[PDB]
Design a protein around this ligand. Structure first.
Ligand SMILES: C[C@@H]1O[C@@H](O)[C@@H](O)[C@H](O)[C@@H]1O[C@@H]1O[C@H](CO)[C@H](O)[C@H](O)[C@H]1O
Ligand SMILES: [Mg+2]
Lengths: 150, 150, 150, 150
């Protein structure tokens, strides 16, 4: 399923993002002057199941979760440098049941253990000055699609 | 290469669209009450190499070409009904050297013999009330990619 | 649909290979000392709709057709060199209605106008000392599959 | 990289199967009357890193590991029923660093925590009466490839 996810907006998913689901987010641009750029996977109750905060200014990408009216938990941090490939950078998120896998354009996959036991009903995209295009292209799968060779 | 092509706008291609090239256009929506929706492949000199006029009202899709300041040639027409698959309809255009292949979601491909011997430098998208999303997602390849098994 | 096509053997297709169909043939090896290696697309009546004779020693690839009991027609020839990429070379055949498209690993596509107006029911593979593996992997599609971004 | 893995045989990988690697195993057949069918991922020292024993008669798929000259460890079991899709069933194995993901045609993936900390140098296939074709097609990637749309 193809969605166009606009900056400072969200897309309501046709079906729950749940174990086996794959979200392939692709940008048509890389804005080198972009600031903190965020993607959130939200439950129907607006709990933030997976928060991805890309922060060029701190050279970090931060992962976290929080309940709608609750506090942020411990942060899981990785370096920002050499993760994205211009001019079409990407983020791929896969739900593995007990954890999410997050893949950027370079480096090994990041794994983030689930903290809130709910499926996602929406994906949100926030930035005052995005690193990426508005919208981003998002293809969401219920399961890994058949793979091309080589 | 990924482009976001907005309605009543165009995208300037990073490289010439030429023999072997593939453009996969995908919409995030289908607006069944939409009106005439147009895609043009344009040369650097703004000649319309391939014009695709999708007309729900006349129940036809019209293919044509014209020079920048010239007249339209003879029309090539096919039925509009049962060509598109909501909610993510698509148009795939392939340059076969002597002719373009155009494939929608249903039916056999349309083949359109080239009339203007130039490569395309841009793709334009026009509609007052589009059948499709704005933008559409466009992936352009210099050659057919490795294919998944399904 | 996946088939394993062995040397000096054939595969009977589950469905007719007809307009829009795609056959992606892939080898697990390349024996550069191999001899003439042939693929045939056969109708139910055993007419050879498309014959591909790959001849390293003559430095040509020859395309032709013939009826079951018939003489070969005129040959359509291209050079052999600079077509195949080791160690997993490929041949992709697409039925465009009035002609076949044949793509190797390098170079522009070859187009071969249809001579016998029948669909293919089988694909055969013959060689005394094949350039390719036994079997080759063959994925056959009724229409071009959705394409990866790269 | 494409391999043809024959029954009661193995393939030596051109590169180590290691974190981020993907092996897509595809059969050209499903033999309904077939018996216990095994795939092993082996290290260069012939330790069995991942053993997959598919047992139609017992309605189970058993996962385990053992050193070359060592005994099996504790088993991890899942149901066999409705995991495979005729006529081209598949198994996809992905190395996630601390664990393997194993995905069949239906149901949720199986995750198997690594027991022996070595990369795999070969994949073996064993059966007296295989559920699957001989060979099976195996495409091995160093990283997840770009994904086609749904
Ligand atoms: C019969 C011809 O023999 C020699 O003249 C070759 O140089 C020609 O190409 C012909 O060879 C035959 O060609 C047909 C296709 O036209 C088949 O490939 C046949 O197997 C081959 O012997
Ligand atoms: Mg009009």
């Amino acid at each position: 399923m193809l969605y166009h996810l606009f900056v400072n907006n969200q897309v309501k998913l046709q079906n729950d993002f749940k174990p086996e689901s794959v979200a392939a987010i692709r940008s048509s641009a890389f804005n080198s002057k972009g600031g903190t750029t965020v993607f959130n996977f939200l439950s129907a109750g607006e709990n933030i199941l997976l928060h991805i905060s890309i922060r060029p200014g701190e050279n970090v990408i931060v992962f976290n979760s929080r309940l709608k009216n609750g506090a942020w938990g411990p942060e899981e941090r990785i370096p920002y440098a050499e993760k994205f490939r211009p001019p079409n950078p990407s983020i791929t998120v896969i739900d593995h049941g007990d954890r999410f896998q997050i893949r950027f354009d370079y480096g090994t996959s990041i794994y983030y253990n689930k903290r809130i036991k709910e499926n996602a009903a929406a994906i949100a995209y926030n930035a005052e000055n995005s690193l990426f295009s508005s919208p981003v292209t998002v293809d969401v799968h219920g399961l890994l699609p058949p793979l091309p060779p080589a």
